[PDB]
C-alpha cells in the first residue's frame, strides 16, 4: 500500500575490508551527511559487516 518515506534510510552498497564481501550499508543519514561520511570513506574509512566482525 502507500506508506511514508523520508530522506534518511539511505544505502551505501559497499564491501567489507577483511572479507571483500558486498555489504548493503543502510545508514539512516541525510543525503549530504551521507556524502560527508562517504568522504570519510574516501579518506580512510571502511565498514566491516557484523557477521564477519563477530566471526573475526
Nearest distance from residue 20's CB to a copy of itself, in Å?
13
Q: Which is nearer to Zn ion, 1 or 50 (CB)?
A: 50
Nearest distance from residue 22's CB to a copy of itself, in Å?
11
Rounded CA-CA distance 33/41 in Å is: 12
- CA-wise closest residue to 29 among 16, 19, 38: 38
Rounded CA-CA distance 35/54 in Å is: 28
Q: Point out which span in 1-9, 10-18, 24-32, 38-46 binds Zn ion (CB under 5 A).
A: 10-18
Residue 16 engages Zn ion in binding (rule: CB under 5 A)? yes
Amino acid at each position: 500500500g502507500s506508506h511514508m518515506a523520508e530522506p534518511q534510510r539511505h544505502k551505501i552498497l559497499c564491501v567489507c575490508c577483511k572479507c571483500d564481501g558486498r555489504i548493503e550499508l543502510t545508514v539512516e543519514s541525510s543525503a549530504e551527511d551521507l556524502r560527508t561520511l562517504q568522504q570519510l570513506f574516501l579518506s580512510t574509512l571502511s565498514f566491516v559487516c557484523p557477521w564477519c566482525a563477530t566471526n573475526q
